[PDB]
Design a protein around this nucleic acid. Structure first.
Lengths: 52, 96, 77, 96, 52
DNA sequence: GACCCTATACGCGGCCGCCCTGGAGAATCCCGGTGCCGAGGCCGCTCAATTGGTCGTAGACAGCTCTAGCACCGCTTAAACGCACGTACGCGCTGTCCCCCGCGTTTTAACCGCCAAGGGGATTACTCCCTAGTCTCCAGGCACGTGTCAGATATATACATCCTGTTCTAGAGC
DNA sequence: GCTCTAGAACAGGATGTATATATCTGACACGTGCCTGGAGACTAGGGAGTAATCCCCTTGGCGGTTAAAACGCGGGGGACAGCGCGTACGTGCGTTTAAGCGGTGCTAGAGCTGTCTACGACCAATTGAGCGGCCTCGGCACCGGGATTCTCCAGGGCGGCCGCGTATAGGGTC
């Protein structure tokens, strides 16, 4: 989460940062797969066929 | 009448709503719908604000995940537009 | 070599039980791979269950608990 | 010689393998695969016959359900064949 | 399961009958959705597009 | 047998759709400036733990023993894997008219600010009836023997569908 | 008007699934021989119920303001398929081939038996920081300003296809 905040430059850990940290690590992704994180959103992933 | 392409603003909105964590369904209609659904179970039932909040967070997360699954079904079927058959297939795959 | 020990007609019969009319030729390797992944997960869970009991043989019983802890409970054992 | 159209033998196989619950996967290759997988975690590891049976039943039921979802995705994509992308989509929706 | 065995022209319940009974009825299938029955098989159903 | 005319394919020039490049309106990121409300730090103070010995014990443990899984012995018949012909289709392109998206406008209800206010979650003083533990045992309950009838494997024969043969009638040709 | 090609539907033969015994090993379940486990009944004190505030907090009521949703509107996008196809499985085979099953050990191992030492909530008691509450402070929310670039219109380069010039082999003629 601190690394994700560093990529975002905020000095405070946000639930978005925690969600990004959880869903970015693969092991944490399979461990916390059926788990909802409030005020976290999702990763900004776009398919290649959707992009022009 | 400068007009953007039908599908560039779609991607821009996708990026905006994926980067931001602000909630999408307004709190009052969701609260009213929750009360309508719960009035068939318990007569004169009260909902605290945090209960409705948590229910809203869970509902938007479930809808968002289902929307990613239906979008993946759409691209899998060589398609861009999602259709209710995608939602039915996604529900039946998980056995809902 | 036992990964290829399972047969293409066995996979065909498995798809027939799943109500599939026809099977593409390049899906056999993918089915073998996902079967290997599933068996690896279940066997890892069963191995941990067996090692916890100071046991050197994987009984049937901790196997069905390993499957049930994964949301895939087994009946009849 | 007599010739059968592509599909009626497939439908007959579907019917005859759905009425009966025989063991489609042979005992010896599945047992050998189980021993090969387990030998990387623990050396000199034994498997009783009922354990192999149970694991084979669970694997066969899981693969049958996965093939059902794969065929479901194929019909959703207006396709008769089942492709590895269909299995990937079914596993992704199922979170595997 | 006994009803399914009666449709199977036999008077002894065997696990295929139990699986058919579980999967045929809605509430028991929903209760046992993540439940696998050995020696049970699946429902004998064919999709509409598969039939000629 | 040699000369001239003619049809056919190879090489070269021209054109147009395809594939790109700037101008400018507008969405998004960095920054100047402020703030105020949420986060970090401090004053009591009040609630769970650990050291000083504890004891029946959940676990641990050497000899034993008892049901059985792995290794390979010939095979035996369900089978699988290499190959050839063909008809089901996967998927690039196809025209288009219906379906979805993007600014404009209005209106429409959501978010907000403050307060009555009446039903509802929390815990203290006290009580109760219903629940853990223990003494004895008997009728419900677990494990071995065994008759046989439900089920499993199987041959033969009947009803049902696919198919190839054939007869008939319609229509083109002379 | 006479001769004859070809499409169309039952007629019988082939094949498939299915009923009917024929039968045969095979375990279902009663009988029995025990057997261990809660039923009956004190002992009683610990958790739950009742209340009893209590507050508290969520529902409703005054709107104000405004981000956003509903209203069609307009041009671009593209979802749902028909055709040719070729291409990758479907469906047959002869051949492996390796999987299914059974008798005889055999000791790895899982309990199993009776035996042996260490081990954790409590017997009673703090105590030292967890947390409620208050003080302070700072960093992203908010408001604009500005830069960078996203990206839609309305102009410049580039290669494939068609028409034409021309070399060349085949046929006609003396």
């Amino acid at each position: 989460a601190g690394n994700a905040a560093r990529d975002n430059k905020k000095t405070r850990i946000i639930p978005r940062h925690l969600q990004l940290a959880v869903r970015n690590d693969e092991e944490l992704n399979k461990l916390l797969g059926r788990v909802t994180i409030a005020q976290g959103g999702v990763l900004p992933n776009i398919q290649s066929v959707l992009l022009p | 009448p400068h007009r953007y392409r039908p599908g560039t603003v779609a991607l821009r909105e996708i990026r905006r709503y994926q980067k931001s964590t602000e909630l999408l369904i307004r709190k009052l209609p969701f609260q009213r719908l929750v009360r309508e659904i719960a009035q068939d179970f318990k007569t004169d039932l009260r909902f605290q604000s945090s209960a409705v909040m948590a229910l809203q967070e869970a509902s938007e997360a479930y809808l968002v995940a289902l929307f990613e699954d239906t979008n993946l079904c759409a691209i899998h079927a060589k398609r861009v537009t999602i259709m209710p058959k995608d939602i039915q297939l996604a529900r039946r795959i998980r056995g809902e | 070599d036992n990964i290829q020990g399972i047969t293409k007609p066995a996979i065909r019969r498995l798809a027939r039980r799943g109500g599939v009319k026809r099977i593409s030729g390049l899906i056999y390797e993918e089915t073998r791979g996902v079967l290997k992944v599933f068996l690896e997960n279940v066997i890892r869970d069963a191995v941990t269950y067996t090692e916890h009991a100071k046991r050197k043989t994987v009984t049937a019983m901790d196997v069905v608990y390993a499957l049930k802890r994964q949301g895939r409970t087994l009946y009849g054992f």
